[PDB]
């Protein structure tokens, strides 16, 4: 109710981290601070909020992966990291003991910006971006266009992604604006309006990235 401003869209990366610290890391019961596995999840949690909101509010900020963002929180606020091992080293041995399935897809948009490209499965009556499993030693952007060739059939061709972990699957959906809306897409393998989607989700994977996708919409205009 009280009118508080929007300082994320105008402040330093040093400050943006500080905020996110208050938000996700620092105000927590000691249990979630005296255990490595726990704070590595709150870093996971704040890196997503950074990539899905902070980066989208302030464009002068760089695109940060959980790899580097943690390195940054460790430097600006070194009071939270008590232990001797490095985060990079820890979030591999400990957090990624929770072995994830990286799924590469994309949120497809039109040149006029009014519609999104989501498909429905054969068995599933649920709408989502072209989502499929990864491989060995291949760039996240090359697995993205290849999976959009298998499920729709149109390669588009980097840092503009939307990371999120959902029940042991690392979804890193990239953002591509500018694909023909008239073009006919068909499955190359054997076996909606944005206005219409905003009103529908408000009534209480794409069901979670509504607000970051609305931030991609509010910005480009």
């Amino acid at each position: 109710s009280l009118p508080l401003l929007r300082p994320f869209e105008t402040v330093s990366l040093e400050n943006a981290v500080e905020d996110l610290v208050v938000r996700f890391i620092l105000n927590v019961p000691p249990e979630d601070l005296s255990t490595v596995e726990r704070v590595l999840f709150h870093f996971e949690e704040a890196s997503w909020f950074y990539t899905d909101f902070v980066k989208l509010m302030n464009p002068y900020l760089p695109n940060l992966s959980i790899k580097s963002f943690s390195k940054i929180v460790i430097d600006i606020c070194p009071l939270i990291w008590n232990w001797d091992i490095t985060p990079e080293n820890a979030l591999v041995k400990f957090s990624n003991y929770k072995k994830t399935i990286p799924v590469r897809g994309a949120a497809i948009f039109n040149d006029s910006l009014s519609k999104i490209l989501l498909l429905r499965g054969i068995n599933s009556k649920h709408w989502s971006f072209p989502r499929g499993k990864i491989g060995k030693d291949e760039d996240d952007v090359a697995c993205c266009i290849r999976e959009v060739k298998e499920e729709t059939g149109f390669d588009l061709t980097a840092d503009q992604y939307v990371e999120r972990n959902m029940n042991g699957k690392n979804f890193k959906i990239f953002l591509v604006k500018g694909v023909p809306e008239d073009f006919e897409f068909k499955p190359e393998h054997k076996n909606k309006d944005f206005k219409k989607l905003s009103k529908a989700i408000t009534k209480n994977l794409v069901n979670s990235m509504i607000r970051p996708l609305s931030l991609y919409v509010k910005n480009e205009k």
């Binding site: 109710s1 402040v11 208050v22 105000n27």
Partner: protein
């Protein structure tokens, strides 16, 4: 280091909130996991605000100061007018960037205002609080009825008795 941490917590919280409400003076209370529920459809609605709760003191202050501008019954009623509100409530969100807020001004200053200078920028009905159904019931200045949750029943009364002191008492400096 276990105590050097809580003093850094008061520092970080404060100047993080100072960037949100620029009129803080003294951070009075902070709890680590709150959730807001709203009343209207004769039942509670889980609002999209979840994170650390904080109750602070506002520098009111430079009289004639603007309550500035940030960017149907479901939307809140933003306070517009003069900066006259004595204390603040804030849930530092984790859901989306916009945080939660409640202006908490005593009835002691309201009755002092409403009678002496009847130049009310916004209609203000004095605030009241209670402990009901594992939630802290808060009746706001713009009639809005909210409810804040915390797991501990100790914490629920803690924030209640403070909110209650703030409104039933005169502007302080602790």
């Amino acid at each position: 280091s276990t105590e050097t941490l809580e003093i850094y917590r008061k520092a970080l919280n404060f100047n993080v909130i100072a960037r949100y409400d620029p009129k803080i003076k003294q951070l009075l209370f902070h709890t680590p996991h709150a959730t807001v529920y709203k009343w209207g459809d004769d039942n509670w609605n889980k609002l999209e605000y979840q994170g650390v709760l904080a109750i602070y003191l506002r520098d009111v202050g430079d009289k004639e100061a603007i309550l500035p501008e940030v960017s149907e019954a479901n939307t809140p009623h933003v306070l517009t007018g003069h900066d006259i509100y004595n204390y603040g409530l804030i849930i530092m969100n984790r859901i989306n960037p916009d945080n939660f807020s409640l202006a908490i001004a005593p009835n002691s200053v309201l009755n002092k205002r409403k009678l002496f200078a009847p130049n009310r920028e916004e209609e203000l009905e004095p605030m009241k609080v209670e402990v009901r159904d594992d939630l802290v019931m808060i009746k706001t200045l713009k009639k809005e009825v909210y409810g804040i949750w915390v797991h501990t029943p100790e914490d629920r009364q803690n924030i209640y008795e403070l909110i209650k002191y703030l409104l039933e008492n005169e502007p302080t400096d602790s």
